[PDB]
Design a protein around this ligand. Sequence first.
Ligand code: NA
Length: 380
Amino acid sequence: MAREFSLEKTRNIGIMAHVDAGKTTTTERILYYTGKITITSAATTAQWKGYRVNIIDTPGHVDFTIEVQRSLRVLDGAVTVLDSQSGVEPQTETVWRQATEYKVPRIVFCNKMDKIGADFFYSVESLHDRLQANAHPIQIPIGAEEDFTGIIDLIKMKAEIYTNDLGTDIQETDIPEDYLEKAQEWREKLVEAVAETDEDLMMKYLEGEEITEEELVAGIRQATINVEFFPVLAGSAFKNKGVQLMLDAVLDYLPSPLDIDAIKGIDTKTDEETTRPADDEAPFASLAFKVMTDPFVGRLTFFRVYSGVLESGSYVLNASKGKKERIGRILQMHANTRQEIDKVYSGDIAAAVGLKDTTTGDTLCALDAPVILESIEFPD
Ligand code: NA
């Protein structure tokens, strides 16, 4: 009947992580924290503090084919996970450059801060040296290796101290005195780096004016969405340290569907290029990204809606196959449940029951406003 979560309050994300960086644990913990109400699902519908969060599956190994490019068009932003002991590795770099080519904003989670050899600053520096990435810490860890016990928020200049490995009984305190100057130092570097991404901010910073928290957070957000800045966080997913903070950063800095360039397509009627921006009033257009065989409802086809709205029990056009398709039931797969819905809006992800001739990469769109979307980048 009504759109539950607005476009502004939607986050379509992927987790970019090599198997050594702890992809599965991080994903499992994210699904746990965002699922409050082995088969890995193509996309999980979830929530975090009033925002819709859709976690989209991505490969744990380097993909040099076309399949990688497709998932990058479905997700809007990503969390890149690093093994704090190793920093950026060759495989990590390739994945990072692909994501930059396809303009995917990212926050970086330096995982395994409790492992022997874990070095947050080394990991941060490797982003600059090996990728020329404009990465800046928005946190500094309290301790390292078995002494890793907390995380300092550079924005608020407060600290979280963990008392267990469950993610409960978190003590919110002031920064310990032995880390205050170091925190001040890294916060100054952060302010300076953010100021360098915005002319109006740099003018104020150079003139010595006070940059507010709201202005600093907004600056980080805009630069991150522009793929010209990468906030760096720390934690241990397996020991439930820094997970909630990282999820907060997804909301704070990663893009909503309105923050991304509108998807391009070919209008088959005029034979010219067009776009399908996130607009519930515009004609329906979507991309299928995974075909699943579910052991309950049967053939499920996952899709991402870019424009318009789709009602369950309707007819749409598979513009890639050149034929009309019936959309029966529509489901959204949660971590612990499966919800049936009668309408999917722009920017959301869902799964249609029993679609006959639809495969990954196909455009599903309005019968009256046909378009072929750019799943694979158009030739030139
Ligand atoms: Na994208």
